[PDB]
Amino acid sequence: EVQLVESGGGLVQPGGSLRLSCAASGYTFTENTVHWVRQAPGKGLEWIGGINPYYGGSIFSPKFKGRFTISADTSKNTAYLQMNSLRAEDTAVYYCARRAGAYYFDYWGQGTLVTVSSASTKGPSVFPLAPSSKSTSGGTAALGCLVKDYFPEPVTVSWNSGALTSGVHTFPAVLQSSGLYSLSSVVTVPSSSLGTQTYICNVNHKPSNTKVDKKVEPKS
């Protein structure tokens, strides 16, 4: 029942500041220290620092002690990471993690992506990828959604509000020459079910507060 949920990630201009938050639930918040670990694209895990919610003090890796600070509100069971003077190499996924026992991290949040770039935010456009077969045809049909021209990363794609997970491939986004990202999400289903089951792709782009639901049906 223990869970940590990060939020606050998005686009930050170079030199800007940003405040990430981590909501903890399922345990007594003051009984465990809470830490921040980041992972840059294609690189490894990096420890930032941690906070003792009961006594209020925090510890930091010296390469962040100046720039970053960590706080906590026991009232809301929440830890915070305030970051200043951001730069390109700060672009990363930021996890909060609970320390337990002999200083291991037993529970992690899903992470929140921070992009430090001077561009502008842009919600995506969603287009259907109609099914490859007709309902009365045999075998397997494939369908999907195309998510085009958004910035920055990331977008989340569920199918039928999460009820459909088996057979789903959400591809990595490719950076188009326009500087905007683009990806496809596809799923394979029994073609016979095209007539008895609706397929909706749920695209969410939090950096631009965009939520789109697109039905995918047979063409023409």
Partner: protein
């Protein structure tokens, strides 16, 4: 600051193999303060082993941890497809440092791709651009050639590809090839096809549609 040097940076092995990953601590590290985490694609790291040798709850017994001098070793005795992940060691001595990571890849038998073709949706057309999508589903190995032919006229430099990570169940890949043209150009031609050459196909497999049903 103590650094953990992890090796190898990646390895390939077949299902059932015994794999070993080593982290060397630059200086002294207590056995209680050395841990191992497993990170699957797109997810947060999961605690795998704690205090050198203790399995975290809900971790199969084929994982084990050991140490010899300053060399800590994570052993997977019988590699499984769901063990496709990046593995990290972590040490504590007030501060924490992680090792660089070890990507573990799975080798398996050849699997031919399932090829699907997706014409642009009228909605996108109204916008002024047309994207045609070629889908290659559940194949192995990753090496695959996808050629975009519009009336046998091999296009070049106008399509981008994207590949998934290995599936955690059958270790297969999927690939999407997106071809982009203008509404104008999309109208000027009739037949659109992608041709796939892969080791699992004795001859290249082509999928096509004529704009206009």
């Amino acid at each position: 600051d103590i650094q953990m040097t992890q090796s190898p940076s990646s390895l390939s092995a077949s299902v059932g193999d015994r794999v070993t990953i080593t982290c060397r601590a630059s200086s002294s590290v207590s056995s209680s303060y050395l841990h191992w985490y497993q990170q699957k694609p797109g997810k947060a790291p999961k605690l795998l082993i704690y205090s050198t040798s203790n399995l975290a709850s809900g971790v199969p017994s084929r994982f084990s941890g050991s140490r010899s001098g300053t060399d800590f070793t994570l052993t997977i005795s019988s590699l499984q497809p769901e063990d496709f992940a990046t593995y990290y060691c972590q040490q504590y001595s007030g501060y924490r440092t992680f090792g660089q990571g070890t990507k573990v890849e799975i080798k398996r038998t050849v699997a031919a791709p399932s090829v699907f073709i997706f014409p642009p949706s009228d909605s996108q057309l109204k916008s002024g651009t047309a994207s045609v999508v070629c889908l290659l589903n559940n194949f192995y190995p990753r090496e695959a050639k996808v050629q975009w032919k519009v009336d046998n006229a091999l296009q070049s430099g106008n399509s981008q590809e994207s590949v998934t990570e290995q599936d955690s169940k059958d270790s297969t890949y999927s690939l999407s090839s997106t071809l982009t043209l203008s509404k104008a150009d999309y109208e000027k031609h009739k037949v659109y096809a992608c041709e796939v050459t892969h080791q699992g196909l004795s001859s290249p497999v082509t999928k096509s549609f004529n704009r206009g049903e």
